[PDB]
Amino acid sequence: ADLYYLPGSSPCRSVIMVAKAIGLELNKKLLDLSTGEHLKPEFVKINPQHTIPTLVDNGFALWESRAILVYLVEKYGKTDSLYPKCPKKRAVINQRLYFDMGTLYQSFANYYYPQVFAKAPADPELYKKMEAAVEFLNTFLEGQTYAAGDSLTIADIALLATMSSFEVAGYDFSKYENVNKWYANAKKVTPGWDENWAGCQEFKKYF
Amino acid sequence: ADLYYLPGSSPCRSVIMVAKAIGLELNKKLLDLSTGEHLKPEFVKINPQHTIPTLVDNGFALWESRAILVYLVEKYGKTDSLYPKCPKKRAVINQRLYFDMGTLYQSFANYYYPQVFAKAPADPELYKKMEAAVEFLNTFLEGQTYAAGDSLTIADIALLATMSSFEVAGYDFSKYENVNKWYANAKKVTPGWDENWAGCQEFKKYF
Ligand SMILES: N[C@@H](CCC(=O)N[C@@H](CS)C(=O)NCC(=O)O)C(=O)O
Ligand SMILES: N[C@@H](CCC(=O)N[C@@H](CS)C(=O)NCC(=O)O)C(=O)O
């Protein structure tokens, strides 16, 4: 399988952790977005939305990090523990995946991107939206070790890419006791944390 | 199964169409956002994020519309046509769902919500981003009657709630040939479209 990717990109680093956790070897291919390499007809033909991460699996094209996480586990995972079959457990993991995209990482992008990519000054009402997101995650984590169920899942792995993006950008989330404890634990147990951490240093350069 | 909803809300209307599509009668519970009902300890105890739609299915709490679509189809669907078992088919549906939330509906919300809910003026740069989203949907649909396969899926139903939202907000998508054709066919074959359209006139009051 091919993975078009940049190491700094959080949704790329989530795919890379899941591929490591299930022991799947990916053919990794850098795509220079600041160059506009992704807008090539070469890559549009693979993915008309021209986004990373994109996977090509024996010619089947797939994008959206979180659709890829599900598919890699479903098709390729030896056990279904990262994404269990039980629809209730799956359903909690899916909700946590939509949260990670539209609440958590979205608030993160919204606050930090305009500072680093368009130079605008910090907007303190987007700061609050961001903290209100982490607070939600804190709440989800109450009395829990992992984000969904009592087990490492693709929900943790996705949220781990996102929350390591938070740290490297300078957001101290120590005040959220459950998130901090989950973060500390997730680094110890997630396969390919160390690769994700390396990739966060390329992401750190934006700041 | 109880569903806390408001009939104008697109993510609620998407769930109610899927329920209709599979023959599931929900107990529909109007949750009055306009009067803070969702923020009270009773609803916060069901969903700590206090968002609609929220399903309560025999004790099991669940939110995020697109998690609910999958869960309903997996549990109550007579067949799996709306969400097939095959990981590759499933993966194209999941990508469109993440597309729906994170690209299409997101652009719509960014452009229109500051106007209707905060009374900010229209932002022509957020307008452009919203048009680029519709163009990507047009591309996805080249040569296709449906959004993610040869058949109607939960991907078309989610997308149908979003695009009927675009309609009553006044967005002109006459210009996208593929979107036009798909939208016309979807209104025809999708169960509960008529009720969706009724709920859209409630949303349209905000304009
Ligand atoms: N929701 C997507 C987010 C992907 C994304 O944001 N990609 C950006 C990273 S900079 C990108 O490729 N931007 C360039 C473009 O859209 O053309 C996912 O989870 O995979
Ligand atoms: N991404 C969610 C969005 C749901 C959502 O944002 N619901 C709003 C509708 S007004 C809500 O309940 N907001 C009130 C609140 O967030 O407290 C989904 O698709 O279910």
Alpha-carbon span B152 to B144, nearest angstrom: 11
DSSP B192: T
Work out the minimum CA distance from B202 to partner chain A, whole angstroms.
24
Structure obtained using: X-ray
The verdict on whether A9 is a catalytic residue reads yes
- The data reach a resolution, in angstroms, of 2.2
Q: What is the largest CA-CA distance in chain A?
A: 50
Q: Which two tokens stand for residue A24?
A: 């799947």
**Residues contacting A176, CB < 8 A, separation 6+:** A134, A135, A137, A138
CB contact under 8 A, B95 and A63: yes
Contact A122, A111 (CB under 8 A): yes
Q: What is the CA radius of gyration of chain A?
A: 17
| Position in ligand 2 atom list of the atom nearest CA B53 | 20
CB atoms within 10 A of CB B159: 28
Q: Taking Cα atoms as reference points, which of A98, A155, A166 lies closest to residue B105?
A: A98
**Residues contacting A138, CB < 8 A, separation 6+:** A176, A177, A178, A179
Q: Is the CB of B65 under 6 A from ligand 2?
A: yes
Half-sphere exposure of A126 (CA within 13 A, CB side): 15
CB pairs under 8 A between A and B: 84
Query: What separation in Å is there between the alpha carbon of B50 and the centre of ligand 2?
Result: 8
CB atoms within 10 A of CB A36: 9
CB contact under 8 A, A106 and B102: yes
For A95, the closest of B67, B74, B98 (CB atoms) is B67
In chain B the domains, ranked by start, together with CATH numbers, are 1-77 (3.40.30.10), 78-207 (1.20.1050.10)
For A35, counting Cβ atoms within 10 Å of its Cβ (0-12 exposed, 13-18 middle, 19+ buried), the class is: exposed
Angle at A109 between CA A103 and CA A112, to 5 degrees: 130
Work out the minimum CA distance from B91 to partner chain A, whole angstroms.
6
SS3 B130: helix
